[PDB]
Amino acid sequence: AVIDIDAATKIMCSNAKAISLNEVEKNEIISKYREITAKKSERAELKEVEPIPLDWPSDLTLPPLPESTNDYVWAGKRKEQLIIDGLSIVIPTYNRAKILAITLACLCNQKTIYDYEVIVADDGSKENIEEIVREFESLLNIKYVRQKDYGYQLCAVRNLGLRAAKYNYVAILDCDMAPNPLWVQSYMELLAVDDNVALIGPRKYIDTSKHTYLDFLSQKSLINEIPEIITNNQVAGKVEQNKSVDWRIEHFKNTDNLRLCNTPFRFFSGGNVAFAKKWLFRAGWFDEEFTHWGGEDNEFGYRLYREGCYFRSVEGAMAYHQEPPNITVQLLQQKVPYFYRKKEKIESATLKRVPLVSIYIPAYNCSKYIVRCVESALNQTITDLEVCICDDGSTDDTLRILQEHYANHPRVRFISQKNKGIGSASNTAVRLCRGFYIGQLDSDDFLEPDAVELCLDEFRKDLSLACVYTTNRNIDREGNLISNGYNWPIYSREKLTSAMICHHFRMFTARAWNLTEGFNESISNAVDYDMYLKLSEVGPFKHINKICYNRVLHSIKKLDIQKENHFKVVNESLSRLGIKKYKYSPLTNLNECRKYTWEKI
């Protein structure tokens, strides 16, 4: 032999090539994998303690957490000016002019206080769409965008309009989705209060066939009067017809309009939605790689979620789908890791467009202990992950080593930058990660073969979890054991705002991270505590009591005053919670002391 890349990854690339590597080889490598990721994290010393420090004030109560990952009421509380100009409404159209007409009519009948433009988006229609639009030029503040015919390009056309949209609030409407008179108002009135929430309107099905667009401009309510169509469903051999309905509405009333749902994107359907345009630049636009089978909605909604955008249902946004003359799970799979992606076995397992996990690593001068650091994650029971490193202007071979090692690794990705400190390094690396579950791994340390896996099981139990940390063992730079890391048994916010109990190896929901101000780039240290204190405000944490992190154990007078300094700021900075009646002051005037006192002000 000589040198190489992990077997974990080796197998996936093999399972990929349509030309089967000889079983004899494949097996030999799989085994080598199985044995290198065989050890199991060893549980830790079972302790016993005071959940919420007694010293903790009995008049102080941190702002209650959110009741789910999409709880927008709680998001509303989070205090923290905007321009409420108008609502650019994009209507994707492929022929059906006589219908776009009706939809344009029901858009003339809008009783709202907001300015709204209608952007008819034509994706290479055959019928003459511009003819229609011109007819309305005298009623709506209408615009027309067109792209040539090159297939089914809804995502592409959706993008044109949204691009053409001039306001800060966009809305999307299939050309067959006739809004009700209160559509604009309903969306806008909510987008004006919270712009971090993507309103989703419901729908009903109507056979608008017996009418022309004139009937609607006339009867400015006719749209709410036309009977919902009926469906001839086949139930076990014999026919059963019922009133076709929006399958989502049932779910809407059972989640308080998705305020409690932990997977709102499952209901996001671009045929009638509204949101702040800023999100397009944050989570991207509709994926044009999607064919007519769909998935683009969920996949888009997912990325909205992964950034921190919320989801909400509006009844005032009811749209009417005009009657046109199964296995979605296999469509997301690749681009939506979170809820949908299920584990494959190394044998049949294969690389993923978007990894389920992203191990970020801030690296500065971690010369020799960095190739050990990266393989400690590439060699994990969870094969569906990636490693993103950020060279913080190392003054040593670090970066050079990363290249002659990972410059072509399908599962590793780095980025160099001029040294800006540890707070930054991270932001840069985290931003590099494309996965939903994100863990921390410093340069000189290294993990345990099932660290990531162990955390992953905890996220799956409570999809409300924002973070999950394990415990660690203090290690010799050389690699020798010399202690077991501090391990506070149970997690609670109070204990956190009293002492840094988030032992190392941490894992957080990218969405949760995005709901935070990110890493603090102006402090020499206390970076971890800050980030994780910030996280505690976003959601609950879960601690596993096993040793999954091997940490190297690596104080000149003046310095110290900084450390003490930083530590207390962090807790104070947590004024974010709108807490001003107290203050976490030191109790002593010593450097290495951490004893604190809740002095009132």
Q: What is the CA radius of gyration of the chain?
A: 28
Q: Which is nearer to ligand UD2, 176 or 445 (CB)?
A: 176
User: Are the beta carbons of 553 and 476 closer than 8 angstroms?
Assistant: yes
Asked if 351 is part of the footprint of its own copies (rule: CB under 8 A), the reply reads no
Supply the minimum distance, in Å, between the C-beta of residue 214 and ligand UD2.
21
Asked if 376 is part of the footprint of its own copies (rule: CB under 8 A), the reply reads no
Asked if 442 is part of the footprint of ligand UDP (rule: CB under 6 A), the reply reads yes
Asked if 141 is part of the footprint of its own copies (rule: CB under 8 A), the reply reads yes
Q: Which is nearer to Mn ion, 490 or 552 (CB)?
A: 552
SS3 119: strand
Asked if 363 is part of the footprint of ligand UDP (rule: CB under 6 A), the reply reads yes
User: Are the beta carbons of 396 and 422 closer than 8 angstroms?
Assistant: no
Asked if 137 is part of the footprint of its own copies (rule: CB under 8 A), the reply reads yes
**Among positions 109, 196, 262, 269, the unique one binding ligand UD2 when judged by CB under 6 A:** 269
Return the structure tokens found at 157. Answer: 């056309």
Residues 517-546 that bind its own copies (CB under 8 A): 522
59 is in an annotated binding site: no
Supply the minimum distance, in Å, between the C-beta of residue 162 and ligand UD2.
13
SS (H, E, C) 151-207: CCCHHHHHHHHHHHCCCCEEEEECCCEEECCCHHHHHHHHHCCCCCEEEECCEEEEC
**Separation between Cα atoms, residue 191 and residue 312, nearest integer Å:** 10
**Separation between Cα atoms, residue 412 and residue 410, nearest integer Å:** 6
Asked if 133 is part of the footprint of its own copies (rule: CB under 8 A), the reply reads yes
Residue whose beta carbon is closest to ligand UD2: 271
Return the structure tokens found at 139. Answer: 């009623």
- Piece of the chain touching ligand UD2 by CB under 6 A; list 1-9, 289-297, 368-376, 461-469: 289-297
Asked if 270 is part of the footprint of ligand UD2 (rule: CB under 6 A), the reply reads yes
SS3 534: helix
Q: Which is nearer to Mn ion, 384 or 444 (CB)?
A: 444
Q: Which residues contact 114 (CB under 8 A, 6 or more apart)?
A: 84, 86, 87, 184, 185, 188
Q: Which of ligand UDP, Mn ion, ligand UD2, none lies near 362, with the C-beta cut-off 5 to 8 A by kind?
A: ligand UDP
Residues 87-116 that bind ligand UD2 (CB under 6 A): 92-94
Q: Which is nearer to ligand UDP, 201 or 362 (CB)?
A: 362
Q: Which residues contact 527 (CB under 8 A, 6 or more apart)?
A: 422, 423, 426, 519, 520
User: Which run of H or of E encompasses 372?
Assistant: helix 371-378
SS (H, E, C) 450-498: CHHHHHHHHHHHCCCCCEEEEEEEEECCCCCECCCCCCCCCCCHHHHCC
**Among positions 40, 78, 98, 146, the unique one binding its own copies when judged by CB under 8 A:** 146
Q: Which residues contact 218 (CB under 8 A, 6 or more apart)?
A: none
**Among positions 94, 144, 488, 549, the unique one binding its own copies when judged by CB under 8 A:** 144
**Separation between Cα atoms, residue 380 and residue 385, nearest integer Å:** 9
Asked if 354 is part of the footprint of its own copies (rule: CB under 8 A), the reply reads no
**Separation between Cα atoms, residue 369 and residue 387, nearest integer Å:** 15
287 is in an annotated binding site: no
Supply the minimum distance, in Å, between the C-beta of residue 121 and its own copies.
10
- With CA atoms as reference, report the closest residue to 194 among 304, 84, 69: 84
Q: Which is nearer to its own copies, 143 or 493 (CB)?
A: 143
**Among positions 6, 71, 297, 528, the unique one binding ligand UD2 when judged by CB under 6 A:** 297
**Among positions 422, 447, 468, 502, the unique one binding ligand UDP when judged by CB under 6 A:** 422
Asked if 266 is part of the footprint of ligand UD2 (rule: CB under 6 A), the reply reads no
Binding residues for UDP-alpha-D-glucuronate: 364, 392, 440-443, 504, 526-527
Residues that bind its own copies (CB under 8 A): 130, 133, 137-138, 141-149, 159-160, 163-166, 522
Residues that bind ligand UDP (CB under 6 A): 362-364, 366, 392, 419, 421-422, 425, 442-444
Residues that bind ligand UD2 (CB under 6 A): 92-94, 123, 152-154, 157, 174-176, 203, 269-271, 293-294, 297, 321
